[PDB]
């Protein structure tokens, strides 16, 4: 039922009425979230610390999963 997933009133992606997103908007913003909608794979969600490649998202989430080093 709930669809709270925003941290800005001014955000036109969201509505400050029932704390939900707009129609055609899945999320507000994030490392794996575009400015209204989800992102696609091969999106840089985090940088490597060393001896690893940059960490990319899957493109079906707002969260950013860490580069599981083996």
UniProtKB/Swiss-Prot annotation:
Short sequence motif named Cell attachment site, residue ranges: 49-51
Disulphide bridges: 4-19, 6-14, 13-36, 27-33, 32-57, 45-64
Disintegrin domain location: 1-70
What the protein does comes down to: Inhibits platelet aggregation induced by ADP, thrombin, platelet-activating factor and collagen. Acts by inhibiting fibrinogen interaction with platelet receptors GPIIb/GPIIIa (ITGA2B/ITGB3).
What name appears for this protein in its UniProt entry? Disintegrin flavoridin
Please tell me the species this chain comes from.
Protobothrops flavoviridis (Habu)
- Specify the taxonomic lineage: Eukaryota, Metazoa, Chordata, Craniata, Vertebrata
